[PDB]
C-alpha cells in the first residue's frame, strides 16, 4: 500500500529504461511489476492516476521522437520509422507486461463499467502511436514507400525489410477502439492510408509504362512484359505487402494493363492469328482471360477467321474437289485438325472457343466453294459419303485396320458438322448396297465399326436400315449355304449358283426392264423357286438383273475364255451363240429390254470391242444404234486374258444415278417433313405457321435444314391432303 508519488519516479525510470533499448535486466522488470501491483492493491478501483501518467508519458515520448523524424529526407525517414517502430513495439510489449496487472485489475473494470475512451496498455501505446507520430508523418512515409516501390518496379532492387515493416505497422495500427474484444486483422487504417495511395500509384505507373511500351515496342513483347508484370505483382504482394491486397491489386492491374488496351489487342489478334504463332496466341488468351467476359467478341473473331480459312482451303482444291472426294475431305479435315490442335493447346480447350470452332466448321462445310459450284449444299455430305466409300472399297492396296479405324473416326468427326445428314445417310446406304451386292467390301469389322459410330452419332433409326442390310446379307449367305447343301443332297445343277437374297424395303434399288431367261438358266431358276417354296412360301422375289454378274465359257472363239459381264451381256452372247447376226430390234424383241438400257449395254459392248458392227468402217464409239442396225459377232477378236471384266460404269448412267439419288432424297425429305408436321400439329392444334416451321426446324435440325419453298410445298400438300384444316383469312394459324 504505497501512494503514486513514491512509486512513480522509480516506475518512470524503469519504463524509460525499457523504452531506450539497453536490454534491461529481469530484476528491474519484476521490480516494476511489483511497483505496479503494490500501487494497484493499495476509490473502489485506483488505476486512473496510473493510467494518466502512462498516457501522458507516451504522448511526451512520441512528441520528442517526432522532432527527430520531423523533416528528414523521404528515403531516410522510412528507415528511421521502421527502426523506431520496431523498438517501440518491442518496448510496448515489455511495458505491457508490467501493466499486465493494469490489464486485469483496472482496464477490464473500466470496460465492464462502459466508460469508453480507455484501452489496454499495449493497445494504448498503439493508439497513441496512431495520434502522435503516425498521423503527422503518415503522408511523408507513404509517399516515401510509394517512391521506393516505384524504384523497385523500375528495376533497382532495394531492402524489402523496410517495406514489410511499414506495411506490418500499418496493419497493426488498425484497432477497433469500441470493441477491443473483436479480434482478427483489422485493416481500416491500412486501407484508408496506404491501399488507396498504393493502388493509385500502381494505376499511374502501369498506365505510363504500358503506353510507352506500346509506342516503342511490338504487341507480342508487350504481352510478354505484361505477363511478367502481373507475376511480379503477385510476388510483390506475396513478399512484402498484406494478403488482402492480392485480389484488389490483381483486379486493378488487369483493368489498367490489359483491359484499357483490349481494343488494340484485337488489332493484333487476327494479325497474330495470320502468323499461326500458337505460343503467342496462348499468351494472348492467358492474358485476356483474366478479364471477365472480355474474350467473347474476341472469341467470335477467331470463328470468323477459321471460316475464311476454310473457304480458302476449298479454293486450294479447285474444280478437282467436285469429282475427287479424297482431296476435298482431306483438306476440310486438315483445316479442322489444325484449328483443333491450336484451340486445344493455346486456348486450353475452352468451351466457348470449341463452340466457335464447331460453328465455323459447320459454316464452311455446309456451304463453301464446291457447294457453290454444284449450286447445292447437298454436294457437301455426298462427296464425304463418296469418301468413306473410297475407304471401304476392296482395292489392290490393303489399308491397315488401326489407321482405317482412325481415319473413319476422323470422317465421323467431319460428318458431325454436316447439316444435311439424311443426304449422307442415303448416299452411304446406296454405296454400301453397291459394295455388298458385289461383295467388294473391305475388312468387315471396319464396316461394323463405322455403322456403330453412325448409330452412336444419330440414334438407332438412322442406321437401322444398314443394320438390317447386314442381317439380310447374313441371311442371304446362310440361304446360299442351305441351297448348296440341298443341291448336293439333290440332283446336281450346271452352274455355281451364289444368289444374294435382298430386302425389298431397306435396300435402295430400282427394278430394271424385263428379261428373257436362258433355258439352262431357267432350269436352275425353277429349282430355286421350288427351293424357296419348300423353305418359306410367305415370301416373293422380283429378280432384277441390273446387278448380276457371272463368268461364261467362250467355246466359239480361239479358246476357253472365262470373262464375266452383266446379265444383259450374257443374254446377248447367248443370242449370238444361237445365231451370230442380230439387229437391235431383234435383240429388243428377243431379250425384252427397253431401248435406253439396251443401247447403253450395246455401246459398252462395242467399247469393250468384243464384237463389231455390220460395217467395220462405220463408227463404234459415236454411233447411235438404230433398231434396224445389224451387229455380227467378231469371231476374229482375241482376248489378252482368260478372265476379262467388262462391268465398268458409264458416265451418263453415273450422272443419272446421282440425280436419281438426289430426287429420291428430295422425296424422302418431303415425306419426312410431311410426317413431322402431321406429328407436331396434333400436339399443339393452334400453332401458327411461322411458329410451326420454327418448331419443325428445332425438332429436325439434327437431320437436315429444309428450304422454305419446300416448307411451303409441304404445307400445300398437307392442306389438300385434308388431314388438317386451315383458318380462313388468317393463314398462319392452323387447326386439326
Amino acid at each position: 500500500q504505497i501512494g503514486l508519488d513514491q512509486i512513480w519516479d522509480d516506475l518512470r525510470a524503469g519504463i524509460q529504461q525499457v523504452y531506450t533499448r539497453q536490454s534491461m535486466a529481469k530484476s528491474r522488470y519484476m521490480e516494476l511489476y511489483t511497483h505496479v501491483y503494490n500501487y494497484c492493491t493499495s476509490a473502489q478501483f485506483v488505476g486512473l492516476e496510473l493510467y494518466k501518467r502512462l498516457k501522458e508519458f507516451l504522448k511526451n515520448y512520441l512528441t520528442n521522437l517526432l522532432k527527430d523524424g520531423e523533416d528528414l529526407m523521404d528515403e531516410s525517414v522510412l528507415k528511421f520509422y521502421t527502426q523506431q517502430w520496431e523498438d517501440y513495439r518491442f518496448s510496448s510489449k515489455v511495458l505491457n507486461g508490467i501493466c499486465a496487472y493494469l490489464n486485469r485489475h483496472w482496464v477490464r473494470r473500466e470496460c465492464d463499467e462502459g466508460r469508453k475512451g480507455i484501452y489496454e496498455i499495449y493497445s494504448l501505446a498503439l493508439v497513441t502511436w496512431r495520434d502522435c507520430l503516425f498521423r503527422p508523418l503518415n503522408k511523408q512515409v507513404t509517399n516515401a514507400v510509394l517512391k521506393l516501390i516505384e524504384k523497385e518496379r523500375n528495376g533497382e532492387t532495394i531492402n524489402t525489410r523496410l517495406i514489410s515493416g511499414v506495411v506490418q505497422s500499418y496493419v497493426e495500427l488498425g484497432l477497433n477502439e469500441d470493441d477491443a474484444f473483436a479480434k482478427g486483422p483489422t485493416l481500416t487504417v491500412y486501407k484508408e492510408s496506404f491501399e488507396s495511395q498504393f493502388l493509385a500509384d500502381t494505376e499511374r505507373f502501369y498506365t505510363r509504362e504500358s503506353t510507352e511500351f506500346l509506342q516503342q515496342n511490338p504487341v507480342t513483347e508487350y504481352m510478354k512484359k505484361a505477363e511478367a508484370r502481373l507475376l511480379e505483382e503477385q510476388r510483390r504482394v506475396q513478399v512484402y505487402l498484406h494478403e488482402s491486397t492480392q485480389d484488389e491489386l490483381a483486379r486493378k492491374c488487369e483493368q489498367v494493363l490489359i483491359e484499357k488496351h483490349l481494343e488494340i489487342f484485337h488489332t493484333e489478334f487476327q494479325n497474330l492469328l495470320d502468323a499461326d504463332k500458337n505460343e503467342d496466341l496462348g499468351r494472348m488468351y492467358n492474358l485476356v482471360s483474366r478479364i471477365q467476359d472480355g474474350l467473347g467478341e474476341l472469341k467470335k473473331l477467331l470463328e470468323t477467321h477459321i471460316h475464311n480459312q476454310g473457304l480458302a482451303a476449298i479454293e486450294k482444291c479447285g474444280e478437282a474437289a467436285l469429282n475427287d472426294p479424297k482431296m476435298y475431305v482431306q483438306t476440310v479435315l486438315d483445316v479442322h485438325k489444325k484449328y483443333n490442335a491450336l484451340v486445344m493447346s493455346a486456348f486450353n480447350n475452352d468451351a466457348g472457343f470449341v463452340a466457335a470452332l464447331d460453328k465455323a466448321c459447320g459454316r464452311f462445310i455446309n456451304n463453301n466453294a464446291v457447294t457453290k459450284m454444284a449450286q447445292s449444299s447437298s454436294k457437301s455430305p455426298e462427296l464425304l459419303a463418296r469418301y468413306c466409300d473410297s475407304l471401304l472399297k476392296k482395292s489392290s492396296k490393303n489399308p491397315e485396320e488401326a489407321e482405317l479405324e482412325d481415319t473413319l473416326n476422323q470422317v465421323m468427326v467431319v460428318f458431325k458438322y454436316i447439316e444435311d445428314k439424311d443426304v449422307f445417310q442415303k448416299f452411304y446406304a446406296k454405296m454400301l448396297a453397291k459394295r455388298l451386292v458385289h461383295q467388294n467390301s473391305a475388312s468387315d469389322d471396319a464396316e461394323a465399326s463405322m455403322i456403330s459410330k453412325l448409330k452412336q452419332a444419330c440414334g438407332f433409326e438412322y442406321t437401322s436400315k444398314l443394320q438390317r442390310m447386314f442381317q439380310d446379307i447374313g441371311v442371304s449367305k446362310d440361304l446360299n449355304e442351305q441351297f448348296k447343301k440341298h443341291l448336293t443332297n439333290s440332283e446336281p445343277l450346271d452352274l455355281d449358283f451364289s444368289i444374294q437374297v435382298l430386302s425389298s424395303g431397306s435396300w435402295p434399288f430400282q427394278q430394271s426392264c424385263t428379261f428373257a431367261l436362258p433355258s439352262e438358266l431357267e432350269r436352275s431358276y425353277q429349282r430355286f423357286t421350288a427351293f424357296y417354296a419348300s423353305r418359306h412360301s410367305g415370301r416373293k422375289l422380283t429378280w432384277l438383273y441390273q446387278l448380276s454378274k457371272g463368268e461364261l465359257v467362250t467355246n466359239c472363239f480361239k479358246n476357253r475364255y472365262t470373262l464375266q459381264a452383266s446379265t444383259f451381256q450374257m443374254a446377248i452372247l447367248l443370242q449370238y451363240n444361237t445365231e451370230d447376226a442380230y439387229t437391235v430390234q431383234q435383240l429388243t424383241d428377243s431379250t425384252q429390254i427397253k431401248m435406253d438400257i439396251l443401247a447403253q449395254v450395246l455401246q459398252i459392248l462395242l467399247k469393250s470391242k468384243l464384237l463389231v458392227l455390220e460395217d467395220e468402217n462405220a463408227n463404234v464409239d459415236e454411233v447411235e444404234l438404230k433398231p434396224d442396225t445389224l451387229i455380227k459377232l467378231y469371231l476374229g477378236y482375241k482376248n489378252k486374258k482368260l478372265r476379262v471384266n467388262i462391268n465398268v460404269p458409264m458416265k451418263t448412267e453415273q450422272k443419272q444415278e446421282q440425280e436419281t439419288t438426289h430426287k429420291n432424297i428430295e422425296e424422302d425429305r418431303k415425306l419426312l417433313i410431311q410426317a413431322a408436321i402431321v406429328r407436331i400439329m396434333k400436339m399443339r392444334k393452334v400453332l401458327k405457321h411461322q411458329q410451326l416451321l420454327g418448331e419443325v426446324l428445332t425438332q429436325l435440325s439434327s437431320r437436315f435444314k429444309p428450304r422454305v419453298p419446300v416448307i411451303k410445298k409441304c404445307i400445300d400438300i398437307l392442306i389438300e391432303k385434308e388431314y388438317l384444316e386451315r383458318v380462313d383469312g388468317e393463314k398462319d394459324t392452323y387447326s386439326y
Partner: peptide, 16 residues
Amino acid sequence: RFEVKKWNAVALWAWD
C-alpha cells in the same frame, strides 16, 4: 456353244 458354270444373282424378298 455356250455353257454356264457360275452366275450370281440378286432377288428382292418382299413381304406380302
